[PDB]
Amino acid sequence: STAGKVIKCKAAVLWEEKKPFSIEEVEVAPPKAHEVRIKMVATGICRSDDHVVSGTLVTPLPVIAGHEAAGIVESIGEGVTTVRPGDKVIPLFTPQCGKCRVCKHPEGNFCLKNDLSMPRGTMQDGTSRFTCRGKPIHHFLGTSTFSQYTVVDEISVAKIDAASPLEKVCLIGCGFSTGYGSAVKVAKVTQGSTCAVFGLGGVGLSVIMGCKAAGAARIIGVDINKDKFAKAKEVGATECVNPQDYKKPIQEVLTEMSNGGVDFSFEVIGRLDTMVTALSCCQEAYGVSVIVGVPPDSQNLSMNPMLLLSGRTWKGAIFGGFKSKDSVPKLVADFMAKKFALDPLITHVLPFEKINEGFDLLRSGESIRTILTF
Template sequence: MADTKPKPIQCKAAVCWEAGKLLSIETVEVAPPKNGEVRVKVLYTGVCHSDLSVLNGSLKIGQKPIILGHEGAGVIESVGSGVTDFKQGDHVVMLWLPQCNKCKSCKSGKTNLCDEFLGGTQGLGTMLDGTTRFTCMGKQIYHFLDCSTFSQYIVVPEMSVCKIEPSAPLDKVCLLGCGIATGYGAALNTAKVEPGSTCAVWGLGPIGMAVIMGCRKAGASRIFGIDINPDKFKQGKAFGMTEGVNPKDHDKPLHEVLTEMTGGGLDYTFECIGNVKCMQTAFESTHKGWGKTIIIGIAPSTDEFCTKPFNFAMGKRIFGSFYGDYKGKDDVPRLIKGYKNGEVLLDEFVTHTMALDKINEAFDLMRESKSLRSVINMWA
């Protein structure tokens, strides 16, 4: 009888050997999936700013050497023992924020923060059993957020994979694994923006543009885009921005400018940069009594947010948002339906598509603010 048990696979991957260095295209060996795991052939992956933050050393997640990437889509190649929800050939999107549907948090209905993410092994760069599935030149290579989509093949826990319909274009829906869902959901789920409201978005990168898209979907009457690069304003208007504001164009503090422009302050503000000074400005720009600030950007872990306690006494509120308060397994298929009916824009975010061996160029484009989202064709 033929042996159908999955075997190790050799493939190409972009390896981060140490922070501050270029990614290196290497041949890696990917072990078979173990109990509760699946092995995925990654076809497309987005390049996210979180990947850059780990690459340059400002975000301390996992260990080196590591394979980055977490906005991936592909096809199930094989499944490990105990896996019943997936089979070979299923089309999937990877989830850096897992959904186990078993833990207290998943069952609570109050959060999308699965306990396996909060207290699991992601920060160590290993699978749940404390080991890795990647090796290169005899060395252990660590995982990134249970995804590592900069490899042509990956092994992930089944709770970190979402099955999608085969007709969905993988080179577009891969973006729903992180940035687009994060911004869109922050407006619709976290803030619950209301029709006729005023909103402002700090940082017109992909997440900021997705926030704008969500505010427009919710019916906001005025949507301000805040950025020091005025070249982004034209692009912002394509997603629904009504007014662009460059802080460098004003002598007054920005919160005073926005308060005057809106007759007392904004209903909703969103910080998408990860800059605590911008967070403070966004908070101070909201209307007393009901203003909401949503913090999306990830600031360095040593930074602290400061404000006057009286702001809270005046009814202003501040919220954090992780992955737009979406649960991946439940909500990615719904977002794909929104994409198909034209409510969720994805094509417009993809400014560059390139092969795996050009991935360092994708990071250069990001650093130089010349891309919105680069998508890597893993097999080009």
């Protein structure tokens, strides 16, 4: 009838680097103790899944990527208590073991039981829940959501509102929370403040919303593509500056506009130079700059430490600084409240079989966000 045993579905497998995804037939073993098996309803395509493909983000291959999705619980293993079959959920790429040095810390969120630091591409027990033909296939993070079914550990799953449109809230899985959290939890934006966001992409758009929910009073969005300027404005940016029309460094034109410099700056592109530029357009005495992302293959940036000496702060974070298991559920509750919208972000919805087409839209172009539906 149901499941309590091996399943057979299609999943997008990466056998080799820089090769497309091969839609294959795989077997998904039943959940062991404290594991949960989920049937995917939708998964978004994020830059990091693409790194894996390039070999930039180094994790054991073949693998089953994806980490930004929402689904419905099919079956739960022994000792599980946070979810029940039928429950809407969101796989968590940043766990919440809830008892490490970091989980217990009032601010920390990068659970020690994560798998990006030193990826293993397995489950918490060190075995894989996947095989294609006779070959085991590795997990991605603790999610591997580019499969019709996946198994995740209980500290890597969040139970959400049962009324949740899983085709839209899947965003809270990475893209949206990463940006939004950077503003409201990491930089801890104050109201009346002036903010600058470098990069008007999806995560970028997310920050501008956090800055807005946060109460900010002025949000300058900066990008060298005039095209991205409308949604940003529509979603929250009060200004949009294209550094390509100025005849001077924009850190300069930025400090001039902010009359001393912005209160908080966000670098959501991942560029080294822009990393330093965003640092300097921040008010020298009490400005806070946040790095939302740095490519897995990033090199060292040159910086003058006198930049920090005045009184400036430089932070980083993963997953918008949010305690994953505790917060994901609340972001949904707020989305449900009518609080924020997620629609201006979804620019494309494709059937899951057309994954490689999703990556093309992504890889080169403008597709703010492509959602793969199962």
